[PDB]
Amino acid sequence: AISIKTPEDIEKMRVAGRLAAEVLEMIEPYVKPGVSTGELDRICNDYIVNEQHAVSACLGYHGYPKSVCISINEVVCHGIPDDAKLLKDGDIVNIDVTVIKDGFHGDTSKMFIVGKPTIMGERLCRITQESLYLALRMVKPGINLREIGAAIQKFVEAEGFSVVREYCGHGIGRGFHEEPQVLHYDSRETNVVLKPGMTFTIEPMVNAGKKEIRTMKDGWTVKTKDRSLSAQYEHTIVVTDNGCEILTLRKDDTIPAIISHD
């Protein structure tokens, strides 16, 4: 079933969420033309282990080789940090962080634009974050996840973009991926009414082109089939009595931590 976190458990999620968010705030200065995704991964890992005294939940997850996922341009998700892959002017890059602290998970990601941003790259990233924000503004007890997924899809497609179907948001806590599944599109299978205490992620993956994806032969990297740009933003939240609280909020987020509907 779906778990309703306790006040104590929620406090632990606040800590884990903050740490995840701070990894993203910490790495920002290093995301510039010339750096390798491999070094970026090392930097994130050292920070998590030595400074936050936490652990990367991704490192080794189902056999994943690195501490964070770094996806560039047409890569949709799970990009594998590589010492030989260098960021270049105009790139859009997602760094997906997941930390475990005191038994609980904090899951978040954001887009970074490298060097001189291209108008389109800036547009895809802006719209993708807006779709996440729009969804977060809908979160409150009584609402069905199907509604939220439908709203994200409607917004995204109105921009000429598409929503990746193979990946979704998810419940989160002592487990990395717990129930429920949080689709970012309208599905006839989705029927989940939100309840206070539920903790999950919303992490829409949006393609500039078609929704179809392709997995590489390294068993992890995923790209858009048509090789169009893809962007993603993610936040871990807890449903409150009449809204929600974003546990992974950053200084650059342009949305409040507490979203009440009173």
Ligand X SMILES: NNC(=O)c1cn2ccc3ccccc3c2n1
Which residues make up each annotated binding site for a divalent metal cation? 96, 107, 170, 203, 234
Contact yes or no for 96/64 (Cβ under 8 A): no
Task: Mark the segment that binds ligand X (CB under 6 A) among 37-45, 59-67, 137-145, 242-250.
Answer: 59-67
The reply to whether 58 sits near ligand X by the rule CB under 6 A is: yes
DSSP 3-state of 139: coil
What order do you get walking across the sheet with 243-246 strand by strand? 178-182, 169-171, 199-202, 235-240, 243-246, 258-260
* Contact map string, positions 102 to 121, toward Mn ion, x by CB under 5 A: -----x--------------
The reply to whether 234 sits near ligand X by the rule CB under 6 A is: yes
The reply to whether 69 sits near ligand X by the rule CB under 6 A is: yes
Residue with tokens 């309208």: 186
The reply to whether 201 sits near Mn ion by the rule CB under 5 A is: yes
* Contact map string, positions 182 to 221, toward Na ion, x by CB under 5 A: ----------------------------------------
Least distance to ligand X, CB of residue 75, Å = 13
Backbone conformation region of residue 199, classed left if phi is above 0, alpha if psi is from -120 to 50, else beta: beta
DSSP 3-state of 238: strand
Rounded (to 5) percent helix, strand, coil in the chain: 30, 30, 45
The reply to whether 128 sits near ligand X by the rule CB under 6 A is: no
Report residue 167: phi and psi, to 5°. Answer: -125, 150
Least distance to ligand X, CB of residue 248, Å = 10
Query: Cβ closer to Na ion: 40 or 75?
Result: 75
Q: Which residues bind Mn ion (CB under 5 A)?
A: 107, 201
